[PDB]
Design a protein around this ligand. Structure first.
Ligand SMILES: C[C@](O)(COc1ccc(F)cc1)C(=O)Nc1ccc([N+](=O)[O-])c(C(F)(F)F)c1
Length: 238
């Protein structure tokens, strides 16, 4: 039942709307990454609200958790698409926004891109199944919380525990759980580097001609700083 639901709510293809006929430029690539990010957020919200037991969380906790986990969720899914679509040869942000090394360099997000390409290769090396991927991705939504706690922290803890139990079931084992939890942990440092990048970019956006969609701008200025300042932290296994 659980996996049937995860498979059923998994978002479909999301395009960036990027102009690939134009020579690559920092401003164009980033404006497309921003637009893509916003488009995916719409789906992340619909996805999360359709997850088993998610509605139990306090209305305000639902939105906060989605906004904090947003980057990580996207990173993990992008790595999987890269692995399945182009065998980690490039980064498949979207069908119309594929990054080769040249674009990784031009986007000024080279370090982060290479870490995501490594994550992408990990799916193959570890032979991650589509079902382990789906459960791990859902678990990611419940892997970052405020030090001051949520409105209903207990309901959150219960939900996170249940998702971990589902992973146990999909695995059924010790070595596998170690492998998967280590892989999940690896997502956080990457999301952090991207968060820092997005923050610095927003602060100087008017100087580099980069366009930031409304929702993203608000989230980068209100939520992301809470993560960068340590008020909101990821939950690591290790
Ligand atoms: C530069 C930026 O547009 C920033 O987007 C943000 C996304 C979330 C957030 F909290 C702050 C910024 C970005 O990283 N976009 C982006 C778009 C799509 C994907 N993707 O589909 O996986 C990613 C990725 F997760 F890879 F890094 C990143």
């Amino acid at each position: 039942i659980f996996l049937n639901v995860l498979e059923a709510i998994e978002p479909g293809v999301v395009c960036a709307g990027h102009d690939n006929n134009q020579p690559d430029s920092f401003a164009a690539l980033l404006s497309s990454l921003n637009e893509l990010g916003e488009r995916q957020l719409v789906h992340v919200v619909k996805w999360a609200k359709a997850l088993p037991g998610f509605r139990n969380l306090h209305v305000d906790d639902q939105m906060a958790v989605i906004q904090y986990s947003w980057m990580g969720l996207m990173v993990f899914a992008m790595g999987w698409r890269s692995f399945t679509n182009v065998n980690s040869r490039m980064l498949y942000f979207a069908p119309d926004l594929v990054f080769n090394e040249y674009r990784m360099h031009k986007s000024r997000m080279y370090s982060q891109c290479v870490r995501m390409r490594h994550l992408s290769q990990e799916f193959g090396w570890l032979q991650i199944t589509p079902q382990e991927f789906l459960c791990m991705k859902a678990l990611l939504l419940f892997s970052i919380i405020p030090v001051d706690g949520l409105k209903n922290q207990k309901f959150f803890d219960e939900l996170r525990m249940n998702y971990i139990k589902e992973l146990d079931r999909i695995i059924a084992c010790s070595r596998r759980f170690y492998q998967l939890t280590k892989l999940l942990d690896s997502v956080q440092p990457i999301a952090r580097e991207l968060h820092q990048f997005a923050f610095d970019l927003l602060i100087k956006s008017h100087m580099v001609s980069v366009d930031f969609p409304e929702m993203m701008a608000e989230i980068i200025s209100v939520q992301v700083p809470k993560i960068l300042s340590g008020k909101v932290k990821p939950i690591y296994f290790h």
